[PDB]
Amino acid sequence: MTTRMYVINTLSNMHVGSGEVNYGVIANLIQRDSVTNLPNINSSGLKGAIREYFKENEDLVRELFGSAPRDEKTLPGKVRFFEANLLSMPVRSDKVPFLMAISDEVLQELITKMKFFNCEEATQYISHLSTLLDNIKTQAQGTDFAYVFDPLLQGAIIEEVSIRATCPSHIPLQPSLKKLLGDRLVILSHKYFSILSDDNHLPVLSRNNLENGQSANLWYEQVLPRYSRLYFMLMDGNAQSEYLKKFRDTLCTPSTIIQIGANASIGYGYCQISELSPF
Template sequence: MKAHLYHIETISNLHVGSGEANEGVIDNLIQRDAITDLPVIHSSSLKGALREHFKTSKVVKYIFGSEANDTSCREAGAFRFFDARLLAVPVRSDKVPYLLATCPAVLKDYCDTIKLFGLKLTDDEKALLNLNAKKTYVVDGKYNGASIEDLDTCAVYNSTLVALSRFLGNSSVLVSDKDFKTLCDNDHLPVIARNYLDNGESKNLWYEQVLPRFSRLYFPVFIPDDTMFGEFQSTLTSSLIQIGGNATVGYGYCKLFLRKMNTND
């Protein structure tokens, strides 16, 4: 089997529910990684969403396996999907509507995943391993001094973050591991009020946590046969994919793309 790594860019707010009871203000929490406590899309949820996207494909059973209600022939899927881990989240700023924030621990986890799955790091990815964040840094000089609203701090331009700018774009910002966890905790991720109306009367008000649009995640997938890769790749990246709940109100629409590689890979 050969591993491939895909990036996910959320085009709309994403809610993949944890299914856990919550005694706090937020009724429906999103899924989180058991170790880092950062937002995640568990592999079962991701696989289910991709299967739905592939439902008209002739190779859906080969890739994903039999349907749960197919008792005639139980068959496991040939592809192996893994959790989609968080790479970056948007943060509000005074100089631009948002900056894309990440941190050294998340970038290291990303690079470690690449190596664990038998892939080679690009030159820019190798450079990401050397980053640290004693302050909050922006990669573009025009954002020097930009206020990061949720952290109540100002970012400083760092001319050495060229690799990060090529990786996430010129509107990216590097924060400390501690600050990144703060940005992703239950007090800082967006919470949206939802309401059920019956003849104009409110019958049920609840609060739902979301991963905000423009967030970035990544996931590896093992593909056993290169002859199937072309169709998998084209179907996966040719249109938006809906992941998680509330599709009818525009949640969870995502753009997927294969990890960019250079000649070192």
């Protein structure tokens, strides 16, 4: 009942600002992971968003999240939040509106993270993901690859990285892996996913401020594509079981929508938190 894995499914474009002064075209850059350079959410922003959703229940917030910043007495937080690392990203396609993109290195990182943290349902997922990765490496033979598993998606083109996907027939994708990584899943090489997720290929949006019809300002914003999947780990310390159960029920309720990041008033960063389903 500890250190379980939660999956974040974005319902809209997400912008979590990095706060670094970029003097190039994109003034507002999104938050990226320190080691893998993949888009991510810091555990600080995740905790802030989840606290903002739960702020109505004062006792639950005090028990699980800690104390208010201007409370006279300080109370340490009992639940440990972890940074949300990117799992799947949507990529444009011709046969289907989009494909779910994941790389072999992303799968390796996920397997290693699950092994280190020992999630609640980690064993079966680790075994099956290792089998899938071994089959993928056997079929690829060290070459660049783009593998889809639905036979109808053969020859689907990734628009940014103009590579058509091939279907390895003997590599099976289990339904639980489909639920986790997403439907219409394409597994690419590390270089293809790095090119897809870099600053030049992530969606960049142009915005302006108008004063009586004439443009006062202009800036470029980059965002995480809608339907992107991110995963984070949640460890509960010496937290009370009743408050933990309330938190997990509310967080994983299908009617619960959490806003993470910037631009809340223009519908940015709205997502659903799902728990790791038993295999």
